[PDB]
């Protein structure tokens with residue numbers, strides 16, 4: 037029993053974290069096989085924040101301008117190339133700790149673990165979700181750029197996020213490991229602002245199923261709803277629309293608990309209307325939206 | 338910016354987790370130097386657990402009754418003994434991944450990271466606090482016994498918890514790595530229950546400081562209070578007493594934010610007496626008490 041925001045064990049990623057330095061700037065890099073991946077803005081000076089021409093900045097660098105430190109060891113950079121907003125530094129040593137891995141671009145609502153790192157040394161691990169507005173609500177200080185987000189399938193690490201920047205509202209933006217940003221963001225210091233964020237409806241429903249699985253039924257009701265009426269109500273509370281895909285994805289949890297998906301939608305509608313009236317669900321006084329249907333099945337039973 | 342419930346990186350502990358099997362029971366063990374540590378209840382059948390005599394059950398077992406698996410490699414058990422409620426299995430090989438480590442016993446209110454494991458394979462990591470009632474609000478399924486809790490100080494892993502059982506309310510009970518239970522619990526299938534819990538006051542205050550550092554300031558007010566006055570309020574709301582040591586420990590946070598501890602106690606007083614009036618603090622509608630002052634300083638500055 038119990039339900040916790042649980043991260044993946046981070047060891048397989050810890051063994052890949054390195055420190056990348058270029059000029060006065062030091063951030064984190066991800067060492068897989070013989071390549072070190074890091075945000076391309078490591079090559080920016082104070083002059084290059086607003087309108088950097090990365091192609092022009094990069095053509096002026098040689099391999100030996102990039103210092104890569106793995107633990108106590110200096111790695112030799114023997115090549116470099118830019119792919120979208122990530123720099124790929126080819127080094128002369130394959131990482132002996134490279135796990136089985138892949139690069140996956142995730143969709144809003146998906147969760148992952150973040151290994152926050154500073155100077156190439158891991159600081160902490162926590163669980164995050166890709167918000168509907170393509171930001172993440174992380175915990176990152178200066179020097180955390182290049183910290184990565186990941187899931188672990190079985191023994192295979194799926195890298196899905198690399199941290200690039202903090203937006204003015206205190207939330208965070210970054211890329212997949214092919215260097216494509218999530219959302220409309222760019223690696224420039226020009227004013228950009230996250231879109232209005234919304235609640236991840238399918239995840240709240242998953243988490244309500246988790247509460248039922250762990251023995252809590254107080255918030256259920258005798259009602260059902262059509263999918264369209266549910267969406268008309270939920271959008272008035274800044275909830276994301278629930279699609280037929282989401283309804284299908286909740287099928288397994290619906291079958292485990294005996295509660296039809298649209299019946300659970302009716303309970304959610306009532307919770308939005310009533311609040312919790314001093315009660316908690318799985319120890320929270322708010323509706324939790326950073327557990328996916330897949331997370332719930334993995335953590336519960 | 339941002340404030341998350343954050344665990345220590347678990348790599349140094351993952352390298353120590355093994356699978357221990359005795360009869361029909363498989364659970365997790367901790368492999369350090371040439372010893373595997375696991376709950377002594379691994380040797381009990383279900384009937385045994387009703388009223389175990391552990392020394393008697395253990396004399397009947399031989400080294401080869403303990404199947405220890407490190408990944409896909411079997412370890413050879415060459416000795417076995419008990420220390421309080423943990424079984425110590427001496428093996429033929431020292432763990433080459435043994436980190437620098439210590440066994441430490443933590444105090445209620447202090448936090449630690451739990452590496453939840455199944456069949457010797459780490460599955461998840463999360464942060465816990467030792468509750469005042471000596472339970473932890475973990476997330477564990479069958480097979481998680483022998484999962485461990487720890488802190489990391491520099492490069493040294495301080496092991497502080499090994500999981501043994503779930504109580505009927507769904508919270509969890511375990512021992513330190515010397516086999517001493519946290520709390521008035523026993524490793525036996527009998528009637529046991531968590532005592533009434535209280536809220537960790539110094540941790541709530543730490544988290545209020547974290548909120549202020551992160552720009553969440555609506556609950557601050559012009560008032561201050563005294564320890565004795567505030568502790569009457571804490572007692573009334575099932576909060577642990579605030580001591581002078583707690584005030585001293587929060588000192589750094591008080592100087593950095595300009596909010597003295599008793600000034601923040603006046604904020605907490607008002608929150609306890611009036612609620613949050615529909616607002617949240619660091620995204621929470623409840624007052625969070627599983628971050629210590631050290632956790633807050635480390636995450637907001639480090």
Ligand SMILES: CC(=O)Nc1ccc2c(c1)CCCC2=O
Pocket residue numbers: 362378381382383384386501502503523524525526527
């Ligand atoms: C095989 C087996 O019966 N294991 C078992 C059962 C019950 C209990 C425990 C272990 C330990 C803690 C107390 C408890 O209730």
Ligand SMILES: [Cl-]
Pocket residue numbers: 559560561562
């Ligand atoms: Cl006053």
Ligand code: NA
Pocket residue numbers: 050051052053054107156157158
């Ligand atoms: Na590292």
Ligand code: NA
Pocket residue numbers: 557558559560561600601603604
């Ligand atoms: Na005040």
